[model samples]
Target chain A: AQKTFKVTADSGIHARPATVLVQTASKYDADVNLEYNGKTVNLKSIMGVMSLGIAKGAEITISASGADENDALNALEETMKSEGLGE
Target chain B: TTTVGVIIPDISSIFYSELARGIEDIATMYKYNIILSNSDQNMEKELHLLNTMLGKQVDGIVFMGGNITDEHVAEFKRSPVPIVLAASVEEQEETPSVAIDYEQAIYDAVKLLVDKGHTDIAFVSGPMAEPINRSKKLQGYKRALEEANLPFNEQFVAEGDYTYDSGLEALQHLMSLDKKPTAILSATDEMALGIIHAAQDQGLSIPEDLDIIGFDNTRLSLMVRPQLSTVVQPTYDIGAVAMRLLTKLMNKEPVEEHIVELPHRIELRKSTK
Candidate 1:
């Protein structure tokens, strides 16, 4: 399953958000990935997320491929919204 | 028959010593005697020295300091002699001076780390009240972060006194944070070295676990375990250019530029990946 969301956090997907995102992604068995500005990186890597520079208002497309794809994507989407990383 | 008075903040600092050598050489080339004074970074004493130098009726003056206040410029304006500022910032631009674009030089340094995948960066700063630190370098740092979409968190900044010991303390302060920085930008080479050693002592790998960049590419940058990535502010050139310009003004020689800003570049080394 795959979904896209625009970052609404004041800091965007910076280290703070990236750190929390990576930690949440690590708990999933799916191959989670984030795509921004036509570039894709492992959602489980903090450095990868930071390098994207996904500033506020930037659109981020996240995809998960594995046995628990729906569950993984749902948890990630919830985390992003609940953590104020995305609307 | 003409004398040039120079006020150096400290005679011991490498930057000041090189600046002095450059000023003395240029002054000698112009057949002028140079009277040098050590301010020791005390503004009251600095003002006293300025008045004494003025009393001696020097033809020109070269002043260098980390903190050159508006009051200092007002005093310089009141002087009967033409004064040239070397490696100092006079924000009002009322004084003829020689310096680099401090804001841009430090901006490039931080941008370099951000490009290398450093998100959590710490700025080890020196006395932020100084215009050079607050207006110039620190502004550049925050700008780079803003432009790069990085967080300019207040926690990422640690204040220092431009000393190696303070640098050491700054690193410890940063490390104590819950989210320690993966890269450090020091305001001076001495502090950079201190941060480098402090991280190494804590077993953090340079450019691996922690990257560091420093301002003022002093020779001390090369003496460290892993050389520092630093912004090269031409210290000698600032002094030499100030003296050369002062000599021109004193002789009523037609000068093309009254205020001179020399070029600056980052000297890359192993400290940054």
Candidate 2:
């Protein structure tokens, strides 16, 4: 399943947010990926995610597929809301 | 794992060493090993090392050197791997690099002196042959004078080797001039310390007898009695940004800017009123 959202933070998914996202995704049993600006990177990969240079107001999508995909996506949405990254 | 080559003029200096630390920290985060080397500010050695790093098949390089001649630019153009400059000045802006606006930084610092009602201002600069000293910093100093409607006194311009001792000699010579300068602007913090000490040895008080300003807020800036006021250059940030830019270049990622100019400001201390 995939969910799309726009970045709300002024800095977008910079180093700190990128780190938190990777950490939250790494604990899951699903293959999670982030799609932005026509490129996709594994959500658990810090370097790959950071290379995207996501900016504020940019649209991005998170997709996951596995037994724990639902749990992973739920955790990520909470992180986004708590971190003020996006809704 | 990929590797990147870092070439710096001096590894012993706190400024350059802190820059290297920034580069290393970012490189580690990216899982890229860096082969750090020194160029000694020698043209041939820099050229040779650049070629050698290419032969070693390094993924990219970060270069820091004074006076990048046309020959160096030619070599840079021919390199198969991408190279970024940190705290280095290139007039043509052909290569990707990161640094503060030397001209504007010095101009602003001198204007501070001008704004304080000082007309007779002196500039202590590094080697005039270097583009940073002659073109960028010197241009800023001259522009400040022009804007202030002050005469550009040739004798007030003192050339130093960016050393403490040279700074001492420059101030001594300037002090001996028939028309003494009411304030002084130094290109480097090391020389600023020298100027401060020399002024003290002559029984002249700082910001009392003469006001002084220095460039590059290195750690040495605070080592003196009435700390040296200097233009704060984000040395570590320059290195980190240059390395990050090189990473983007190597990965063929879309970059916003090739010539990155960081922000700079003058920090006031006891040296200036």
Candidate 3:
């Protein structure tokens, strides 16, 4: 399953928020990934998260597979909301 | 008999001493006698110095340090002699200047540290009010940290008044933090030396317990046990170039440009790993 969202925060995805997202994605059984600027990155790595350098108003796509796809998406959405990435 | 007026910010700093050496070297070469004075960044003192120099009937003036105050600017505009600045003031259309690219030099230094795998870095800046020391260097530090994906922590930044005492205070402030930085950077050689001394007082070793670097590669950089890594601004060359340009302008020759910004480089040493 794949879900996409827009970063609406004024400061965009900074180090703290990126760290949280990466840590959250590491927990699921399925392989998780994030896509930005036409490039895909492993969601479990801190360096990969920072490499995106996603600023405000950037659209991000999260993808997962296997039986835990829905759970993975839900967790990612929760992480984004918890990080105050919403408008 | 041609007299040249020279105004320096502080005579105590070794950086300015080198600049003076360079100016004197060239002045001697050109057979021009210079009258040197100190401003200490005080506008009134600078005005007084300018007035004194003008009253002495100097043929040309070489302003070394401090921001040119409004009164100083007025005096320069109305003065009968030509004026040139070195290492401090920016060159206007009429006033020629010789200096280094402060922002670029600082940025390159920070980039070098970042490349060495330093993420948690602290900046000890001198006097947030000084245009060159505070604004340009601080801007470079911030930009480099941001570009390297390092979090800009207000707690990691401390301001000093470019004094040895203030340097000690700034170092103490950084040392008191629970999340102490792995590497530290200072805006001047004096502050870096002071910080190194403070670190030793706290029983910390350079490039071991903490990595330290500074701007203005002065004699103090090598005087310490662990030599400091710093940016060399070609201080003497700055003075020489300014004097040469001033001579050209005085001779009514076609000078290249009013403002000449020279190149600078970072001299790596044991202070930073």
Highest DockQ scorer: 2
- What is the fnat of model 2 with respect to the true interface contacts? 0.00
lDDT of 2 by residue, B1-273 (tens): 499999999999877997897688668766899998898899989999999998789999999999899889888988999999988999989999988899999999999999999999999999999999999999999999999999888899999998899999999999999999999999999999899999999999998999989898877888987888889786766776778789899999988779988667777888987
Over 4 Å off, model 3? A1-87, B69-74, B89-94
Model 1 agreement with the true structure over B165-228: per-residue lDDT tens digits:
9998899899999999998999899999999999888988887888889888777989997989
Which runs of model 1 end up more than 4 angstroms from their true locations? A1-87
Clashing pairs in 3: none
Q: Best to worst by TM-score, what's the order?
A: 2, 1, 3
Computed on C-alpha atoms, the DockQ of candidate 3 is 0.01
Q: Which ten residues in a row have the lowest lDDT in candidate 1 chain B?
A: B233-242
Window of ten residues with lowest summed lDDT in model 2 chain A:
A10-19
- Model 2, residue pairs in steric clash: none
Best-to-worst ranking by lDDT: 2, 1, 3
Best by TM-score: 2
Best of the two (1, 3) by lDDT: 1
Global lDDT of each candidate: 0.83, 0.86, 0.77
Q: What is the Å distance of residue B184 in model 1 from its true position?
A: 0.7
